[PDB]
Design a protein around this nucleic acid. Structure first.
Lengths: 126, 106, 156, 227
RNA sequence: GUUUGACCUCAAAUCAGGUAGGAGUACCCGCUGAAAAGCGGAGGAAAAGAAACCAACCGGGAUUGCCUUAGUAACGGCGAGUGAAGCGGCAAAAGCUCAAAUUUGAAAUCUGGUACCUUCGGUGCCCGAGUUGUAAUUUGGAGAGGGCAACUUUGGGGCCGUUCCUUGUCUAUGUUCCUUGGAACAGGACGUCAUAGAGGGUGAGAAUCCCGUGUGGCGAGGAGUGCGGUUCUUUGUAAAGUGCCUUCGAAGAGUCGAGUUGUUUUGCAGCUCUAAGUGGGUGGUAAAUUCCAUCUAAAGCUAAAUAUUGGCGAGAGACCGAUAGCGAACAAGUACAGUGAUGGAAAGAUGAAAAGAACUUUGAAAAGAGAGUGAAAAAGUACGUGAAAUUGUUGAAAGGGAAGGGCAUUUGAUCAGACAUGGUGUUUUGUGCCCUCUGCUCCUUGUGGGUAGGGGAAUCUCGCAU
RNA sequence: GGACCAAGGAGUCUAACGUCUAUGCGAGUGUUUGGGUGUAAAACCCAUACGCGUAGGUUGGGGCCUCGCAAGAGGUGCACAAUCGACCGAUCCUGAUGUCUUCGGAUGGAUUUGAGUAAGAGCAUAGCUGUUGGGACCCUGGUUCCUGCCGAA
RNA sequence: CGUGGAGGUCAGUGACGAAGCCUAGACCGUAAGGUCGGGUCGAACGGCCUCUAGUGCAGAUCUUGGUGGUAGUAGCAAAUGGGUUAGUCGAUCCUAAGAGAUGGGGAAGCUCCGUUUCAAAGGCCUGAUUUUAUGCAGGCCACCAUCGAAAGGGAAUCCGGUUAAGAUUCCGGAACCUGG
RNA sequence: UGAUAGAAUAAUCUAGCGAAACCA
RNA sequence: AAACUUUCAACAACGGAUCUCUUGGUUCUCGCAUCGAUGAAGAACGCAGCGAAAUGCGAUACGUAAUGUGAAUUGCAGAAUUCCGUGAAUCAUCGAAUCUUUGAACGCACAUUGCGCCCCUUGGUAUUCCAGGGGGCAUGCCUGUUUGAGCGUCAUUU
């Protein structure tokens, strides 16, 4: 359990931390676990998701679907993946706001910041 | 109206003080070397007690100066007077035992 | 949290100047001797750790009860029914002589003594009543002390 | 709040009996009486009809009071100590506690008291050797030095006889802690207190031989109704 | 010398450098003060604080605070009641600085300006300040001058660590099958981690999905002398300490005190008077032309133990759950009211996702009706749930200027009303823990428990099925 | 005293004495000012002080024993009560042996005396309650569940 | 008997529906009340042994909210974007009755007196000021801050045209005033 | 831009809007 | 008989009670010590592509620069990141700047948008005159520098 005094376990404080979080903390919160293959690739379980990479959906009503992230809607703690949309009765399209805890990353978009992050997290990066 | 809700807390804080002070005073005790002194007031005149400081003349009888003895951690009171023999002698033996057990770094 | 200041600081875009202290106030580093910093344990106490050292933690007469901590078995009285190590290390360190330097003499005044040593020789009553090169009129025996220090330094 | 219409019946007025801080919170207890309660709890933990009477899954354990070697204290990893309690046979009690995690029905759910669950074994050690860290993560288990022996940990909810596991050195050390007629007490001027009745069974005394000699013959044990 | 110059005083500077104010004010300290308000002044504490103390003892030993002394002493129309203190135990402990006699063989002291330098400063030079006294030394516990004998001691930097602060980063284990569900984070089966089963989020109760949590690790930038190593220097007849001898050996005056007045319950203040130096203050004491005790007032500083409804932060709660809790969970000191000083509300919940109702049509417009989304509009921005009072329609009944209930019964309407379907004996056949033979295994070792193989019901017998 | 209805809404807390009851210990009792300890406002241990208390007879008579088949008889007698005592303190007289000329109380009386002696009972915690005070049930009016038992002036 | 919360326990119940609501549905309780059915509903909640209390309402012309009748009555207020253009018009400047800093003096003090008073109360001219050789010399003048008038005093503008709403202030022409 | 409209001549009806007192 | 009245039931109204939550209070404990003339708090006026309040800011105006992180922001619109980076972001951090008018409020005044004075810079024919830009100019007190004054005192024939 909670051993440090400087850690707190109040529900009210925790929700006030969660909903009032700044966006730089949110991309740390908006994290998705990698695949078994990507864990076999880099030796690492979960990562902060961004928009350029590719993912699959492992829960929800749209389970067993996949795609590249269109945009990360950090303000709603959510992430619009391309091609997973509800088509309205006008015919227009609106994506389902997914949540990265229910997602599994399939193909990473690797960058120098990303490669250095994998290196600092102990990754066996090729 | 006041309630000591902090009675549990302050003690903890006080031991924190007794920790933290001790950190700075790491070999030395927290307290000085105090005299064993018989009490006044016939209700208490059979009682012996911790006193404030010894005297100049007693510390000279121990074989050192009080100005140096404050650096050794021996509490010294000038305004006390030594008037009983056995009090004086027992406190001299106390000073000697304290001298026996210290090791001083140069 | 009902002062106007606290509510504005809550609603502000600044964010609270938050620092956490309560964990690190329990733990202390001893800061003073590296030997005690080695044998310090951060687990026992000030009291238990000083006892395990061998150093007398509080001087005299603790209020309360110490831990007698069950070192031995105490048996009932029948009433006659019918039929050191770190102490040793610090003791070596305080016993260790520091590399000390002898207090030497200054060049002008040892030269002054050298003038006196050739003017009078060794005798002191003549050099005591010497005006030239004893203008500070040094004490009878201070002369001896400085000359003996000078001779042990130089010239036997 | 102190000052924070004017009626107890009123909306927004001051309430009847503003709750003040200086109402008594802590309660002074005689020290011998508190020690007596702890002694009765310790004596009750042996019995294990009491432990079943509280509710524990101790039906397959080796004996009572359950005593394990002191080597248990030297375990510093959670999985090993849990496997050790499997090897004991308190596994069913642990599974009971683990299944028993329910959510609190009160408002106090959102007063940081959200979850509730039963209590399990109590491990008594003479000396820590990493055991208290190893059992810290498994739920329902609570460790105690023999010197403390917390009554709240002993008889939770004032129900006597929590399931208690002893280490070997702790069980010997209990003689040091409470004394006997042989070992003194290690507590200043304390004595393990006496009984007012020696034999715990009254029906044994009644049906013994000699009361059964001294006593007149009995009735029908229900009255024969006449008229 | 009608001149010139020292001073001294007082002015002036758009001269240089500094500083005061105001806000807040929980705690603190002063002043004023009713039936508290007010004023002034500070700080993280403040105040107080190193005895002109307390005691009467086998004496104690700065201040502060806690427990006890103690509801005692004492006071009080001795009425109301008011209401201490010594000692003891504890927390915390710390002591110092001036003012008095000369450095007179050298004002040795400092601000300021300037030039440099390693700049919370240093060095040099020059103005000044200052003898109407700035330094060194000495504050009674003495101390000073010498002398003797010895010993004993040295200071200043750097740097790198350490310590402290502020951060940054890394550090476990299922998203395995089945059911239900719109959504598994639910239920069942099988797991793994744990020094991590605190907490939160994720479309429902998530250790193992995520963030964390726990354990340790690696940094970064500062603060800093706290100490720990190195390194560079520091002496100049420099500074200090201890014992003995010799010679000396100076301290708070409009104060102490006295009277009076006010004020307080003895101090304080005002007015008047106003001292001493083997002095003075204070208290006991008496076998009395008393003795003894105990401090040094009228100058100053001092951490810590202490208070803290304020600030800056944390962490908690046998607290309240939107008429409660702050007046204010919400664009609350707001809208509003008052000329002002001031007073001061009401107001939380769509859904998991707005997916917030495309399109047709009525309709000024408001509102509809088809249609559709959605798990649910029995969730449509009037929105969780949706009670009562009260309203509308329909049905039934009663009433004709009828009021309600209680009992008891009809009539009318209406509801409930077996997943009941077995037992006993006999008989047929078949099967097995039934019979027989051959085993294995657990201990609680017995009046035991589990379990295998083949054979048989041809005969018996039990259970089961029939 | 009332248009109705919903919600809110009135003997709470604390201090000081007092009875009762329960509990621990017992002529002692009381850990928690404080110290040590800790898994940390918990629990555990406790030095020195302090608080409050402590510092004969007769008659019966619960019972018990003996005898008596029983009825009863005899004996020892708890608590407590009455009597007669005793002693201490007081009470008012006696006023010795001595006596510093006013000191002294020896002895003997007398009544009552007293939570007196003549062999302890208290301390601490909790609960329920009595009186008083703090706003003290709420604002003359109001004052919130049932049943049983007892029940006046 | 009931209510909020707390400790223990029922490995209690629960998205295959908790709690709540309704129930001309049944049952058990003497009652306080409890149990179930059905309907609605969407996320928590109960039994037992104990603890704890902001723990039980019909009234208090109680508080707050909601809704009646009165009443379709009284009665008809009972609640119902654009635009201003100035040397000449004013303010500004001057003083009036009066107000009021400073220098001073009173007052424990908030401040009070006083207004040119018992003040060192500035700004002008000349200079080979004739030798002291790189330092200001010789004269002149004389009362006093400031505020106080959109009607007193006071430099200077007229005609014609024009705008939904402006003009001695804009447009066209023709004038004047002050300072340099 | 402001005001109950309509009709009765520009001197009662309709329409629209719409209370409060009080209420075992 | 209808209409009306009453009662009951059904559905629909009205109403927000109950239940369940809760970025809110409330109380306790722990640590820390930090506002100004280097212009506080407080007031006013503005600043967003499209803003009303809330927040933030000051004409550099929902911000600039710096550092870190590393692709967003999000109601719409619109830039992008040469993307393996000197780099979005209503991001974080924040040590360098800007900081409108007031306000202890400070050139004098003040019912004026009145009246200034000094210094620095630039231009307009510029030696005069004018325009622009910039910066100072409150009181008290202390120390020092500089300038005076006094019938204050004293000296003044080597």
């Amino acid at each position: 359990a909670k051993q440090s005094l400087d850690v707190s376990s109040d529900r009210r404080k925790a929700r006030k931390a969660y909903f009032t979080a700044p966006s730089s903390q949110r991309r740390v919160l908006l994290s998705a676990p990698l695949s078994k293959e990507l864990r076999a690739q880099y030796g690492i379980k979960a990562l902060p998701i961004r928009r350029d990479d590719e993912v699959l959906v492992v829960r929800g009503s749209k389970k067993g679907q996949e795609g590249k992230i269109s945009s990360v809607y950090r303000l709603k703690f959510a992430v619009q993946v391309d091609k997973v949309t509800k088509e309205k009765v006008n015919g227009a399209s609106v994506p389902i706001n997914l949540h990265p805890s229910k997602l599994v990353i399939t193909k990473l978009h690797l960058d120098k910041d990303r490669k250095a992050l994998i290196q600092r997290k102990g990754g066996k990066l090729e | 109206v006041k309630v000591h809700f902090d009675q549990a807390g302050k003690k903890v804080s006080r031991r924190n003080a007794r920790a933290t002070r001790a950190a700075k005073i790491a070999p030395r005790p927290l307290d000085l070397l105090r005299p064993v002194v018989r009490a006044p007031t016939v209700k208490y005149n059979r009682k012996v007690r911790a006193g404030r400081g010894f005297t100049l003349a007693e510390v000279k009888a121990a074989g050192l100066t009080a100005a140096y003895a404050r650096t050794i951690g021996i509490a010294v009171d000038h305004r006390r007077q030594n008037r009983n023999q056995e009090i004086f002698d027992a406190n001299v033996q106390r000073l000697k035992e304290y001298q026996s057990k210290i090791i001083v770094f140069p | 949290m009902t002062s106007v200041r606290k509510r504005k600081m809550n609603r502000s875009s600044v964010g609270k100047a938050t620092r956490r202290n309560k964990d690190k106030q329990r733990k202390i580093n001893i800061q003073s001797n590296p030997i005690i910093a080695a044998n310090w344990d951060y687990s026992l106490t000030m009291a238990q750790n000083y006892k395990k050292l061998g150093l007398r933690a509080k001087l005299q007469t603790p209020a309360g009860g110490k831990e007698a901590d069950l070192s031995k078995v105490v048996k009932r009285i029948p009433l006659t029914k019918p039929v050191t190590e770190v102490v040793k290390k610090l003791e070596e360190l305080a016993s260790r002589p520091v590399i000390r330097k002898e207090r030497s003499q200054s060049e002008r005044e040892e030269e002054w003594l050298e003038k006196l040593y050739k003017k009078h020789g060794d005798d002191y009553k003549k050099m005591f009543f010497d005006k030239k090169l004893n203008i500070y009129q040094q004490s009878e025996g201070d002369l001896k002390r400085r000359l003996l220090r000078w001779k042990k330094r130089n010239g036997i | 709040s102190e000052k924070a219409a004017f009626g107890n019946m009123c909306r927004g007025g001051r309430m009847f009996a503003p709750t003040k801080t200086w109402r008594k919170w802590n309660v002074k207890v005689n020290h011998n009486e508190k020690r007596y309660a702890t002694a009765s709890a310790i004596a009750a933990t042996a019995v294990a009809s009491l432990v079943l009477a509280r509710g524990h899954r101790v039906e397959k354990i080796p004996e009572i009071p359950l005593v394990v070697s002191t080597d248990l204290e030297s375990i510093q990893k959670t999985k090993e100590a849990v496997a050790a309690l499997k090897a004991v046979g308190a596994h069913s009690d642990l599974l009971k506690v683990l299944k028993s995690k329910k959510l609190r029905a009160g408002k106090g759910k959102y007063r940081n008291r959200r979850w509730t669950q039963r209590r399990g074994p109590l491990v008594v050690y003479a000396e820590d050797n990493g055991i208290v860290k190893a059992l810290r993560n498994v739920p329902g288990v609570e460790t105690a030095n023999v010197a403390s022996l917390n009554l709240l940990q002993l008889a939770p909810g004032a129900h006597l006889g929590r399931f208690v596991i002893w280490t070997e050195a702790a069980f010997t050390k209990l003689d040091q802690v409470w004394g006997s007629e042989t070992v003194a007490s290690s507590k200043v001027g304390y004595t393990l207190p006496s009984h007012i009745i020696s034999t715990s069974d009254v029906t044994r005394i009644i049906n013994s031989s000699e009361i059964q000699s001294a006593i007149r013959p009995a009735g029908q044990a229900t009255q024969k109704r006449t008229h």
